[PDB]
Amino acid sequence: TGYLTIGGQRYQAEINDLENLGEMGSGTCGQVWKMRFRKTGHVIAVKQMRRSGNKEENKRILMDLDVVLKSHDCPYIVQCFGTFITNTDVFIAMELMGTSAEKLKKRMQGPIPERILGKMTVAIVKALYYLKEKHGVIHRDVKPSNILLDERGQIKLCDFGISGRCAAYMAPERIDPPDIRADVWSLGISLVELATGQFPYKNCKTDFEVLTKVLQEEPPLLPGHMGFSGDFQSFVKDCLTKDHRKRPKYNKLLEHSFIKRYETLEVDVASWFKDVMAKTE
Numbered sequence: 001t002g003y004l005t006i007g008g009q010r011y012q013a014e015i016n017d018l019e020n021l022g023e024m025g026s027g028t029c030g031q032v033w034k035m036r037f038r039k040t041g042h043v044i045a046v047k048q049m050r051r052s053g054n055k056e057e058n059k060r061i062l063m064d065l066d067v068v069l070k071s072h073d074c075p076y077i078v079q080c081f082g083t084f085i086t087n088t089d090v091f092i093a094m095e096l097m098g099t100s101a102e103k104l105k106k107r108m109q110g111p112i113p114e115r116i117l118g119k120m121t122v123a124i125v126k127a128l129y130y131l132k133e134k135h136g137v138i139h140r141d142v143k144p145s146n147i148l149l150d151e152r153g154q155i156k157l158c159d160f161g162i163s164g165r166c167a168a169y170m171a172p173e174r175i176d177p178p179d180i181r182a183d184v185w186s187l188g189i190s191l192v193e194l195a196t197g198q199f200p201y202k203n204c205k206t207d208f209e210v211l212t213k214v215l216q217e218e219p220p221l222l223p224g225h226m227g228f229s230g231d232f233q234s235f236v237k238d239c240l241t242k243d244h245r246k247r248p249k250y251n252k253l254l255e256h257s258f259i260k261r262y263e264t265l266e267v268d269v270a271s272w273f274k275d276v277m278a279k280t281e
């Protein structure tokens, strides 16, 4: 504690070293500030956890921090630059991302292109596989609000609930018991939602009505007439295997033709992202 490390360089720091650029509405019940580190001009996200704060909130902030601090070797999980501890507060300095896939979809007012969702799929599957294999963590809440993007073209799993521990994204076997395969289902619903710009059970008025459609209806499909590659349609069809005992695990998805393509294909996510942000001021 008491220092930040940013691109391998370690800087002594305390909270006085940071200029408060205002709240970021990340939809948490804890204060998160955008802050400028005066020593270097880096802009960062700083969580402020008050000693007098809500006990539920503080506990989950610390459980998430525990996983982030041990995830320095995953390029697909948002990183902690450092912590400051005072008599009344803990400040947690995080990588500042641009936005969440949920907000990106709201701003776009339409589909996100397959080539962006390909780079997103590689990153999030590798993140969830890293969490399970390295830390024994089942994430249990995969959805667009937990997928972060920035103007440098990085796509990372959010720290929010990253320790594990709506029901729009819930797998059939979690609704009605018969495991990482439930998160594979959530990923499939997230991809259909982002690819179409339409949540696949949209006309539901209550969370229970959504659960009834997950169980009673056919899994949602990518539409056939939007020029989606055969690889992307097959990837989503596999994720949305209703019987979980036939649904692939991450090690199997990581061999899928869709992920192999996007591991090596050059996609300028950064310029797409800045463009979308430009076309939407």
Ligand SMILES: C#CCNC(=O)c1cc(NC(=O)C=C)cc(-c2n[nH]c3ccccc23)c1
Pocket: 024, 025, 026, 027, 034, 045, 078, 094, 095, 096, 097, 098, 099, 100, 101, 102, 103, 144, 145, 146, 148, 158, 159, 160
């Ligand atoms: C203005 C401006 C610049 N950036 C944003 O507003 C912005 C917006 C969002 N939105 C959401 O997560 C919503 C789903 C998230 C983040 C973010 N950066 N770093 C993080 C570490 C952990 C959790 C969240 C974040 C930054």
